[PDB]
């Protein structure tokens, strides 16, 4: 009992709050209570961007957390919250976990330091592009792609996988983002 770890979290809605608590209780109902006793604290979302970093610092790091959780807000903004929390907790190399954010830039341990997520990103589904096209007697591609980082990463992944077949696509022409 004297050892007490302090896993924090950052969820979306207050109700999920309760869920989180009950979850961690199960993690103690089965595993032991001598050198452990995981203690769970959390916070809820804010819209003021820099307020995210300020709040996460002041609240979550004041309780010497060990690994923060992160999830998308109820209203979508593509990136929103993982960037501030990722940067702030990456100052001290405190590993965080993603829960929904499947966008491809994060999977680069040079601009995000420490970030482990639990859903494969968009780019990985490129593999399914291959396997399916491998089975339905097809060997030709005219793929389009955006110019954003997501498109670049997806096209590079597909080309790297496909060049193993000693083959290549026909055209890789890319349009500018937000075109009319």
């Amino acid at each position, epitope marked *: *009992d*004297p050892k007490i770890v302090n896993i924090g979290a950052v969820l979306s809605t207050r109700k999920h709050e309760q869920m989180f608590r009950e979850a961690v209780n199960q993690a103690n*109902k089965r595993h*032991g*209570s*001598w050198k452990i006793q995981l203690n769970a604290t959390s916070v809820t979302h804010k819209p003021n961007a820099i307020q995210m970093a300020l709040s996460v610092c002041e609240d979550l790091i004041s309780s010497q957390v060990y690994a923060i959780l992160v999830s998308h807000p109820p209203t979508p903004n593509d990136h929103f919250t993982p960037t501030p929390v990722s940067y702030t907790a990456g100052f001290y190399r405190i590993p965080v976990l993603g829960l929904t954010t499947r966008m491809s830039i994060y999977s680069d341990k040079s601009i995000h330091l420490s970030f482990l997520r639990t859903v494969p990103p968009y780019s990985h589904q490129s593999s399914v592009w291959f396997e399916m096209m491998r089975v339905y007697s097809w060997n030709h591609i005219i793929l389009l792609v955006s110019d954003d980082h997501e498109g670049r990463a997806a096209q590079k992944r597909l080309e790297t996988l496909l060049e193993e077949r000693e083959s290549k696509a026909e055209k890789v022409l890319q349009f500018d983002p937000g075109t009319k």
Partner: antibody
Framework: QVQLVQSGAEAKKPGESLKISCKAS????????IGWVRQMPGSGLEWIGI????????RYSPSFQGHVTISADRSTSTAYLQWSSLKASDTAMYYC????????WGQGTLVTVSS | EIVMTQSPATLSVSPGGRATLSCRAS??????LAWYQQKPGQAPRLLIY???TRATGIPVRFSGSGSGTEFTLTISSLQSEDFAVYYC???????????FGQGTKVEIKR
């Protein structure tokens, strides 16, 4: 800083029903696997039951099922021990321990069943 | 449903010696052991769990070792206010098993 004071001694003839307490203190009650053990005169110790006081989940020994029903209550943390009836050959002493590696035992409350 | 074997029974050491209490399982329990001391007219206490670690507020004279079978506890420099009955117990399938032992009994020599 944990005390597990038990209840006073008890003696009664065969047939009736028993009720003893293990009221705890000093720690968040609904997080630890309270259990019970029994010691007859000069043989050693054996296990009888265990209960998590957060979901009232319970389990029992290979041969103790149905004789004694363990309980709980989250108002004063007192973990009772309901006795069915009779059990004349049950003169022993009953301890209530805490954390499945049992650490913080309580007092002794011998139960006497004679004629 | 795991029987337990503890020997010897009435070890007797001079009041500066040591002890080599043994507790052997019937199967291969990796590390799920605990040792208990019970002085007369009292309720036992915990001193070792995990077959190697020490509890809180326990002197350094105690230490244990072993795995699989033939668990050993060695009291170093047996002081005077020893002489309690000892016990060993294991917890592998928990919570289902909780099988104790029979334990030895030290007796100082004067």
């Amino acid at each position: 800083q944990v005390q597990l004071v038990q209840s006073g001694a008890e003696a009664k003839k065969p047939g009736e029903s028993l009720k003893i307490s293990c009221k705890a203190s000093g720690y968040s009650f609904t997080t630890f696997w309270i259990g019970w053990v029994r010691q007859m005169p000069g043989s050693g110790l054996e296990w009888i039951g265990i209960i998590y006081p957060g979901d009232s989940d319970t389990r029992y020994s290979p041969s103790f099922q149905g004789h004694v029903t363990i309980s709980a209550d989250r108002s004063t943390s007192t973990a009772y021990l309901q006795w069915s009836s009779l059990k004349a050959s049950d003169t022993a002493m009953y301890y209530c321990a805490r954390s499945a590696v049992f650490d913080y035992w309580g007092q002794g409350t011998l139960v006497t069943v004679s004629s | 449903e795991i029987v337990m074997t503890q020997s010897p029974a009435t070890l007797s050491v001079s009041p500066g010696g040591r002890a080599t209490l043994s507790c052997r399982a019937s199967q291969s329990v990796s590390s799920n052991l605990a040792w208990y001391q019970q002085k007369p007219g009292q309720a036992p206490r915990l001193l070792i769990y995990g077959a190697s670690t020490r509890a809180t507020g326990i002197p350094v004279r105690f230490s244990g070792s072993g795995s699989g079978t033939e668990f050993t506890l060695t009291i170093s420099s047996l002081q005077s206010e020893d002489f309690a009955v000892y016990y060993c117990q294991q917890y592998n399938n928990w919570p289902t098993s909780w099988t104790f032992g029979q334990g030895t009994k030290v007796e100082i020599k004067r």
